[PDB]
Write a protein that binds this DNA or RNA. Structure first.
Lengths: 395, 154
RNA sequence: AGUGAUUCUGCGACGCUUGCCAACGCCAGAUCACUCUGGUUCAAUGUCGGGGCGCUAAAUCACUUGCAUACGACUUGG
RNA sequence: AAGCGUUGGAUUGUUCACCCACUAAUAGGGAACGUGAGCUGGGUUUAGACCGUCGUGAGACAGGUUAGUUUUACCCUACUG
RNA sequence: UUUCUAGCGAAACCACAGCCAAGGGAACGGGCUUGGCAAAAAUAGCGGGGAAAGAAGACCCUGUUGAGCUUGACUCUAGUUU
RNA sequence: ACUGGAACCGGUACGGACUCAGGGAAUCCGACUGUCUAAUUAAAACAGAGGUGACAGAUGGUCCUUGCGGACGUUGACUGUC
RNA sequence: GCCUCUAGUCGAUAGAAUAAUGUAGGUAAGGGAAGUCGGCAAACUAGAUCCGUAACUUCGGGAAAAGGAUUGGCUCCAGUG
RNA sequence: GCCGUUGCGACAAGGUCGUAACGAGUAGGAAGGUCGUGGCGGUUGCGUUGAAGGCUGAGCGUAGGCUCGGCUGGAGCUUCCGUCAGUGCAGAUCGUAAUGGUAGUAGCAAAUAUUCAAGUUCGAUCCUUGAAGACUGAAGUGG
RNA sequence: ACGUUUCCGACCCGUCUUGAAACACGGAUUGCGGAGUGCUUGUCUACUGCGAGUCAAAGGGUGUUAAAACCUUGCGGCGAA
RNA sequence: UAAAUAUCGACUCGAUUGCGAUAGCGAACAAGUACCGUGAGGGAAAGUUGCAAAGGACUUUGAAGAGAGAGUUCAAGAGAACGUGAAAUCGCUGGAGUGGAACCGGAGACAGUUGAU
C-alpha cells in the first residue's frame, strides 16, 4: 500500500556511503579547465583552519535592502604559509585516462618534505632521496634528468607541480610536511615545464594564487563524530515516547518483498569525517604574515585604526597564533580547527553579482573567543580596567 | 594417563613434560600453546611473560568467535588476539617442569627448542546455573591436557 | 638517433655463422618392422652451490599527540 | 513526460467520510489489502460485568457499553558502518 | 549497561545449508531452468527474509470421542404423600 | 515554654534541603465504609443498611446422616430461615 | 523525610573507556495538547499564620471550595505562673 | 556379447547343457537366498604358537554379505544336516546414554564505596591489623 | 577404491496425498534397544502314517542317563445316514 | 468324618532348548537403598586391575595437583574413574584443495596400490 501522506526521503543518497574518509588530506578530484591564453599560475593551495570571527562590512548591492548599509558577517580564517615547490610531474592521455609519465624532484628537498615518506623518521637513517640528490651533480644523472624534462615537454597534456607545506615556521609540534600535486594552468606545455623548472625549490605565496573578492572551493574532511544512530546520522523522526526497545530508530527498514534490506534505508554508523568539496566561498581578505612590516596590523582596516593582528585576544582557541599569511573566507568551512584545507580555484565561470561584489571591510572582531570577550586588545582591556593589585604590588 | 601425540625425533637429546585435567580454559590455552610452536625455550618464556604483562598478544586463530581487536595483533598477521594470563601461568609451569627434566637428563638448557606442543580437551566438571521459571542448566568447566617435547638444537 | 597508446625501430662498429658449381667426388651414418622422443623437443618458475660488477634499509610493538576513536583504525613526536 | 512535490487540523478505532485553513498542488495506487522478534492496542477477538430483543431454561445476538499479560535474535543472509 | 580486558561461562534452535531477477512448479524457491554474478579471516549494530522460535490451532469442520450446565428430551432414583 | 508586635539587616530566594491535594463546570453508573476473579478483567460486579413477600405455635419448619441419630436450638414470631 | 551517636557493615567478580541502542534520573529558547484512541507520561499544587470562600444540599456537608497576603537572620518590646 | 525369466528339448539329475522369445513398476502376492543373527538334537573342525570383540589393505558376489592379509585383544569359537525363534532399523516431536555448531558467545549491571601501609603465604581487590572515607540510622544492615 | 583435477548428469530423505524439492509434517549427531506375537477355534493348502476306519483322554503297567522312552481302551471324539 | 483335589505365600530342595548387566525381578552391587512428596505414595543409577598387590621403593622439578627417570609384572599402552575400548565429537604432524554450499552417479588423467612361467 502507498504511504498515507507523502514526504521527501531523509538525506542525500549521492553522498553515500557515509564512511570515514580514505585519507586525512583532501583529494582534488578535478582541476579547473586549462586556458592556454592566461598567464601561468597554480590552481590550488593548502592551509589550516585557524578559527572563526565576525566582521562588519559596508554592502554595495543595488536593489537590496542592505545597500549602502553596514552588516555583520561570520568569517573563517585559514592560515596559508608559503608552499615550497619540490617536484614537477606530467600526465599523458591514454585510452584509459591520464597516466603519470615521469616525475622530477628538486636537487635539495627539505627535511620536513622528506619526513612524509616515513612513519618512524627519527628512528630511521633518513636515506630518502640520498642517491637521487647525487644524480643532479653527476654526468649521467644530469642526462637522465634532462631527458625526463624533454619527455615532459614533448608528450604530456597536463603538468603538475608537487608542492609541500612548511611546518617549522609555525613553531608547532608537527614537523612532517604535507605534499600535494597542483596542476599548472596557462601557457603551453613547454612554458609550463619551464616555469616549474624555474620554481623548483622556490616558495609560492598565496596572494600569487588567489585574489580579493574571488570565489574558491574548499576540499577536505568534515568534523568527525564517531558511531551515531539514525536519528543523528540521517535526521529521521523520533518515535513516540511509548515505544518499546527504543525510539531513536527507523520503525520499518523495508517491505516484505524484496526480502532484503535496501541500500537506501537509514542505518546507524559513522557520522562525520567525510570527504567534501564546498564551492563558492568568497574571499573577504588576504592578509600578510604578522611577522613582516606589511602584516604588522593585518587585523585592522582603513576605518579601524587600532593596530592589531588577526589573532584574537588570548590566541585562536585550540589552534594557536596565526603569524603567517591568511585568507578570510565568508561563512563556514568544513572540518574542525587545525584541519588541513585544500583551497582550489573555481571550475565555474562565475556570473552572479555576489561573485564580482567588492568587499569593503570596516572592522574585524578580535575579542577573546573563550568566554564572552569585552575588549578588542589587551591595551584596551588594561586602559578600561585601570590598574590592578598585581601592578600595585609590582610598584 | 594421556599418551603423547608425537614422539621425539631423537629421544637422547630431548625432554618431555605433561599435565592432565588442568582447570584452565581449553580454547585459551590451546591458542596460547599454538603460539609457542617452534620457539626457543627462552623466547617462549619471554613471550609468556610478555603476554602476562600485556606487552605481547596471543593470536586467536581457531577459537576467535567474538574476540576483540588490538594493535599488538599485527605482529601475528591476524586481527584477533587476547592475553590469557591463566593459560600463560600453566604453560610457564609446564615449561619449568620440562627445563627441570632436561637438567635431570643432562642437556644444555640454553639450546632447547619447543619441538612439539599439544593441548587436548579433558573430562568436564559439572556445576549448576539457575534460570528463569524454575529451570536448571549445566554450568560446565572445560579442562585440558597439555604436553610439550623440547629438543636440543645445534 | 628516433619512436611514449615502452617497448620497438634505423644507422653503423665489432664478433658467430650463412649460399652455389666440381660433387654424393671422399669419409660417417645402420639399434633388426612402428608404438612418447625432433629419436636429448620447448617453455615457465622454485631452491641449493661457485663466481662478476654492486647496496649497506625499513616497518611494528610500547610510550606520546588529539583534528580521530566502541575495539581495531586515523593524525602527531622522540 | 513519474525528474520532483502532493501539507496543518476538528469529529470518528476507524480504511472511508465531512468540514476548517493554507498551498504550485492538495492525483490515484503497489510492494503477503508493504511494514506487531518496528511500536501502539483505540477496534475486533476468550474468560468479569451491564442494557435491549430472543429463549421455560442453561444461554444467543457483524446490537450497544465498560475492563481486559503484545514473549525470544547472541545464528545465517541482507543492510550499515 | 552495551564496548575492550582478566577470571568464569550457559541456553533456545539446527534435514543439508545460506546473494539475486524471471520462469515453471503444491499456483510466493536457498537448491530446479535461463540469466545477473561470484575472492580470505573477521569486530560493532540491525531488525527485510529465513512463509524464523516457542505449542500435535484454544477459531471452523469431522468423530456414531467427552465433559460442565439446562429442560417440556428418554430411562431411572434419594426423598416425600397416600 | 508558647503567643503577638516593632526597628534593623541581605539576596536570585526565607515551608531556601526534606516532607505534602493542581483547581473548576457538567453527564452516566453505583447511595456511602467494605469485598472479589492468588498469576491478564478492582468495576457499573458482590455485599450493604432500608423495603416487600413466603413458611413455621414445636405432635412444628428448614437441613444433614447408610443407619442410629444430629444442626439452627443455651432458639419460641421484636424469633428462625428463605 | 534528611544528618549524627552506641552497635554493625563496606557483602553484592573486578579493571580501562565513556561509541550506537537501551534502563533510570536532570534540564531546555519561542509556542503550549497543534501530539495521541485518549493530556498516557511528565509538569503544575502543597507546610504553617491571617483573611475569604459559590451552586447545591439529606442542613450533617460541599470546604483545604475557589482565591489572596505573610514566612529568613538579628536586636528588642508585651502577655501568659 | 553377457546375466536372468519363460516355453521347449537332450542327457544315468534337488544337476548340467542346448535352444527361441522375453526383461517398466506403486499398493500387493509368490519364489530363491552355500544373505545375515541366536538356540536345541546331531555332525565337521579351529584355538594362550592367540578365540570372540575392535580398526583397516588384496579380493569374491548383481546384491544381501563373505574370505584372506596387517594391527589391537586375551578365551572361546566353528562347518554341514534337521528344527525352532525375544532373528536384520534411518526415521515413530521413538526409549536410554553420550556428544557437537551456537561459543569462549548471551552474560556474571538493583540494595551510594572504597583507599593507603603492613602481616601471613609459593601465591592476597576479596583473610587479619592500623589509619582514612562512607553507609544502616533505634518502625536499624543493632541486641 | 569416501585423495586431487577435468567433461556430462545431478533439488532432501520418510510420510499422507490427484499432486512434495516444497513457503506441508518428523528428522542437530552417534551408539545400543525398538514394533504382525502367544493361545483357543475354524477353513484351505502342502507333507507324513493308517484307512471304513483313525486317534485315542483321563488312567493304569513299566522305566533310574524316571517329567523322557515303551506297553496298555466292551466304552470316548470325528467318520461310516 | 480321612483319601483322591488346590496352592510355592512360608521353610527346604532339584532342574531348564529361558536372560547374560539398556536383558533378567524395581533391585547380580551398603535396593525397596539414595533421593522426592505434608501425605497416600513414587523410586533409580551402580558388575569386571592382576594368577598373585607384587597397588609403583628410591632420585629429581614444583607449594601441590602433577611430571621426568626408576621398579613390579606374561603384560601396565592392565596404574587404581584400572578387561576389551567402537561411533559421534575433538587436537596435533604431513600432503592436497579452497570465487555465494558441500556431498553424489558415469568417463578419463594424475598420485598411489598391486601382479608378472
Amino acid at each position: 500500500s502507498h504511504r498515507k501522506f507523502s514526504a521527501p526521503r531523509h538525506g542525500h543518497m549521492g553522498f553515500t556511503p557515509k564512511k570515514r574518509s580514505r585519507t586525512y588530506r583532501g583529494r582534488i578530484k578535478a582541476f579547473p579547465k586549462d586556458d592556454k591564453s592566461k598567464p601561468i599560475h597554480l590552481t590550488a593551495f593548502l592551509g589550516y583552519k585557524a578559527g572563526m570571527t565576525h566582521i562588519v562590512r559596508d554592502v554595495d548591492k543595488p536593489g537590496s535592502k542592505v545597500n549602502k548599509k553596514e552588516v555583520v558577517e561570520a568569517v573563517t580564517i585559514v592560515e596559508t604559509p608559503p608552499m615550497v615547490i619540490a617536484g614537477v610531474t606530467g600526465y599523458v592521455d591514454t585510452p584509459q585516462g591520464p597516466r603519470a609519465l615521469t616525475t622530477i624532484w628538486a636537487e635539495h628537498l627539505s627535511e620536513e618534505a622528506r619526513r612524509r615518506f616515513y612513519s618512524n623518521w627519527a628512528k630511521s637513517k633518513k636515506k630518502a632521496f640520498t642517491k637521487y640528490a647525487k644524480k643532479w651533480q653527476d654526468e649521467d644523472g644530469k642526462k637522465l634528468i634532462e631527458a625526463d624534462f624533454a619527455k615532459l615537454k614533448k608528450y604530456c597534456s597536463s603538468i603538475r607541480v608537487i608542492a609541500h607545506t612548511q611546518m617549522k615556521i609555525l613553531r608547532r609540534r608537527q614537523k612532517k610536511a604535507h605534499l600535494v600535486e597542483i596542476q599548472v594552468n596557462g601557457g603551453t606545455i613547454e612554458q609550463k615545464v619551464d616555469w616549474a623548472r624555474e620554481h623548483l625549490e622556490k616558495q609560492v605565496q598565496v596572494d600569487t594564487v588567489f585574489a580579493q573578492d574571488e570565489m574558491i572551493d574548499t576540499i577536505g574532511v568534515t568534523r568527525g563524530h564517531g558511531f551515531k544512530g539514525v536519528t543523528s546520522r540521517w535526521h529521521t523522526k523520533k518515535l513516540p515516547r511509548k515505544t518499546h526497545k527504543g525510539l531513536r530508530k527507523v520503525a520499518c527498514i523495508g517491505a516484505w518483498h524484496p526480502s532484503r534490506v535496501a541500500f537506501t534505508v537509514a542505518r546507524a554508523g559513522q557520522k562525520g569525517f567525510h570527504h567534501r568539496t564546498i564551492i563558492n566561498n568568497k574571499i573577504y581578505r588576504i592578509g600578510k604574515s604578522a611577522l613582516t612590516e606589511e602584516g604588522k596590523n593585518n587585523g585592522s582596516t582603513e576605518f579601524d585604526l587600532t593596530q592589531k593582528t588577526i589573532t584574537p585576544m588570548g590566541g585562536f582557541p585550540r589552534y594557536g597564533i596565526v603569524n603567517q599569511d591568511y585568507i578570510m573566507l565568508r561563512g563556514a568551512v568544513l572540518g574542525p580547527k587545525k584541519r588541513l584545507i585544500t583551497l582550489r580555484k573555481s571550475l565555474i565561470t562565475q556570473t552572479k553579482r555576489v561573485a564580482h561584489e567588492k568587499i569593503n571591510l570596516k572592522w574585524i572582531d578580535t575579542s577573546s573567543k573563550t568566554g564572552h570577550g569585552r575588549f578588542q586588545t589587551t591595551a584596551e582591556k588594561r586602559a578600561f580596567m585601570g590598574k590592578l593589585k598585581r601592578d600595585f604590588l609590582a610598584e | 594417563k594421556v599418551h603423547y601425540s608425537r614422539a621425539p625425533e631423537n629421544s637422547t637429546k630431548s625432554c618431555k613434560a605433561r599435565g592432565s585435567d588442568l582447570r584452565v580454559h581449553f580454547k585459551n590455552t590451546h591458542e596460547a600453546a599454538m603460539a609457542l610452536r617452534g620457539m626457543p625455550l627462552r623466547r617462549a618464556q619471554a613471550f609468556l611473560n610478555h603476554v602476562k604483562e600485556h606487552k605481547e598478544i596471543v593470536p586467536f586463530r581457531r577459537f576467535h568467535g567474538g574476540i576483540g581487536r588490538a594493535a599488538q595483533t599485527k605482529q601475528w598477521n591476524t586481527t584477533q588476539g587476547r592475553w590469557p594470563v591463566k593459560s600463560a601461568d600453566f604453560l610457564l609451569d609446564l615449561l619449568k617442569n620440562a627445563e627441570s627434566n632436561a637438567e635431570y637428563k643432562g642437556l644444555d638448557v640454553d639450546h632447547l627448542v619447543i619441538e612439539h606442543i599439544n593441548v587436548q580437551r579433558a573430562a568436564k566438571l559439572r556445576r549448576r546455573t539457575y534460570r528463569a521459571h524454575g529451570r536448571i542448566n549445566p554450568y560446565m568447566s572445560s579442562p585440558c591436557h597439555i604436553e610439550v617435547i623440547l629438543a636440543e638444537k645445534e
